[PDB]
Amino acid sequence: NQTLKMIKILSGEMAIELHLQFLIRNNNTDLMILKNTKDAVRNSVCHTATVIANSFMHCGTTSDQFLRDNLEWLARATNWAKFTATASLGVIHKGHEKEALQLMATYLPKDTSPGSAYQEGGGLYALGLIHANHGGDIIDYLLNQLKNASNDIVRHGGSLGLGLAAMGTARQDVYDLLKTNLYQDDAVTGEAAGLALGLVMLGSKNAQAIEDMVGYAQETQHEKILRGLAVGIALVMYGRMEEADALIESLCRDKDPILRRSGMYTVAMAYCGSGNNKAIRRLLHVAVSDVNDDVRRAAVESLGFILFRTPEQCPSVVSLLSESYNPHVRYGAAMALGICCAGTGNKEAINLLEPMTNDPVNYVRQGALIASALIMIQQTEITCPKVNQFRQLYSKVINDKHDDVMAKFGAILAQGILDAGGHNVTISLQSRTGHTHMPSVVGVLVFTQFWFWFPLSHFLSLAYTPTCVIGLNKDLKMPKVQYKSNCKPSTFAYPAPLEEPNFQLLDNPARVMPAQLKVLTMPETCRYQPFKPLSIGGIIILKDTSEDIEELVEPVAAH
């Protein structure tokens, strides 16, 4: 009896369910910012960017009200843009496993001048997105679809869904099917095949998969396959630390620049958070010495993954790369600071990124905006002074009708990241208790590949870790418990929607900033008592001290 409950808890269904309920209840996304943004979108690039940002802010909240209102504007998407929109639909519905097949069937395919294969592939990839890291029940359906999939675009979307749902499971059947799809030797599906091999055998250190993938990367001719296999090789060796030195050397000495980029990504993933001085030395030597711009950018951004566990040491090393003559090195330094100090709101990082928001090179500006949004997620004006200024900067860049299209794309995604999940999520590569959150690391790394493939940007939704404090009873249901934040209400409140006591009371679930968790206590008058000290926060069990009848938090409906 009780063991079944423990298995239910460990399987994650209850945890994702309560996270989803917290997101729906505390859904405070502002639609006016998106209204202005869609007012200021002219080209298809900014259109896709707006779609992605809408997905980002409604990530997991299952609130597609913006898309429902602006279906006419959404219909302008076509080809891979339509694919990306259909995928973002899944990011909106993150965690909605129960009615996943039914809801995807509500967007049933059709027939028109586009073969709707983009729609099918986007639906498959969105289905994989809903079941990120938890595809245990969708795996067989997606396997059957992929084996039965005939179109190329459908194959790409399905491979992405398979890899992302079976992330890290290291199952052999899915690996074999995706290896078959990769060996079908096609560019459009090859990116998805390589990424899916990276996801499925994530952190496995398997000699067979690595050998097959490296050999194919040295054998094929399609560059998209090369990028997919590069990120796949990176993800297969995740967190393996010094065990990956042989592969790291073998990819560093490769003649192909894509393989050198793969080696840099592998250096990032194997030593994520270690701060290993040898890995930092290799990364810096490559970033200042390599002849290919992309490899320099990858090497210098990998410092973020290496140093995220010590963010205060990180601007000290990336500041000089921020001023490098090479525009790719500058963009990589921006992304390294954004990855490195993600969700920390570091003051030095922003003091670095502020002058870099006006770099003459457009993609450097886009990267600076993305990184600033990553760092300032959920931050408030008192916590970090420049947040409002950066919001104004994003709005100006969107409303500047002469700024470059890439810069506008970056600003759209920055707006989406800043208010992600209705200001209810942050980016935390570290776990609550100090672990490396593998889904967050993988999602951020693959999101950095948006430079090469726009639909890869939805992978960032994995890094969206809710900033919530869930109190549970012995039944595991949710009692109506109120928590006390011993701080000024405006210190960690929601940002003022677009148009005084020293404490505040917070209900269950409690949306609490990671800095707010420190000063958040619980009143003595409350009949419950925290089990683990409330400073660590997160899913917290409250021990009841009275037999007075419990009033449970009424479960909100979906959407």
Binding site: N43, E223, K255, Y363, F454
Partner: protein
């Protein structure tokens, strides 16, 4: 309706670039043209394996300037040689006009794209490709129907196509209105790089060949005289510095003169001494 991606790249082979440059210079001041051989690896890659020139014709660079018989015999006979690559596209040199397509160029490109949808019309400037910069661009087309209905000519899925900025000259001559510039990437493997490195690899000899001692003394005397004059200028400037709160420096010119004297003299001494040791009677 499928649209060519903005990430599509034209992988120009190294020798393809060399042949294009040589043929473009040869034709100056006239315009030359030739056919580009390779394979359409995928929808995002065009690999120009090779190029062969075409006879200069009185028409200029047009679709009547491609001799069907010459094109044929060259194609079958190169296939016999071991280059069985489909004709990817064509090229012609705009000498000093920059890279763009004139009305006849778009006409010929339409003729070429009648053969295959993926077919580029790269051009090269043989005189603006002075040492350093190489002025070559690759345009395919913009079908009139796609533009007039308002849809963007190419779908975008990455920043690859936006890394480089289009030029005003090409823009006025119809870029982004009748044709789009495809990013050009140079497939250069290590073997070809090492072989090209022999162009300026001096020898194993001049690493041991001493510079003429009399010329060495004259160079040294000239440099030390220049060091004299620069040092006098430095002394005068520094004497001014004291009667100067923060408000060509003889110092820098002095410094690079010092650096040149350093390298020349130290190299001469060391080289002479190694020549004493290794080039020994024993």
């Amino acid at each position: 309706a499928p649209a060519v991606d903005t990430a599509e790249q034209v992988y120009i082979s190294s020798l393809a670039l060399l042949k294009m440059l040589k043929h473009g210079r040869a034709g100056v001041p006239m315009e030359v043209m030739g056919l580009m051989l390779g394979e359409f690896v995928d929808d995002y890659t065009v690999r120009v394996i090779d190029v062969f020139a075409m006879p200069q014709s009185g028409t200029g660079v047009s679709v009547e300037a491609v001799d069907p018989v010459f094109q044929a015999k060259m194609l079958d006979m190169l296939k016999q040689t071991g280059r069985p690559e489909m004709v990817v596209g064509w090229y012609h040199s705009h000498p000093g006009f920059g890279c763009w397509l004139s009305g006849v160029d778009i006409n010929t490109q339409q003729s070429f794209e009648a053969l295959s949808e993926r077919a580029v019309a790269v051009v090269v400037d043989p005189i603006q490709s002075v040492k350093g910069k190489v002025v070559i661009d690759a345009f395919r087309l913009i079908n009139a129907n796609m533009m007039v209905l308002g849809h963007e000519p190419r779908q975008t899925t990455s920043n690859l196509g936006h890394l480089n900025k289009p030029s005003i000259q090409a823009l006025i001559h119809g870029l982004n209105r009748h044709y789009y510039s495809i990013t050009i990437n140079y497939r250069k493997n290590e073997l070809e790089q090492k072989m090209l490195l022999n162009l300026h690899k001096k020898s194993w000899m001049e690493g041991l060949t001493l510079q003429d001692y009399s010329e060495h003394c004259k160079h040294n005397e000239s440099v030390v005289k220049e060091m004299l004059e620069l040092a006098k200028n430095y002394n005068k400037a520094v004497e001014e510095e004291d009667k100067m709160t923060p408000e060509q420096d003889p110092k820098r010119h002095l410094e690079e003169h010092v650096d040149v004297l350093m390298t020349s003299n130290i190299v001469q001494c060391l080289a002479a001494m190694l020549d004493t040791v290794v080039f020994k009677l024993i």
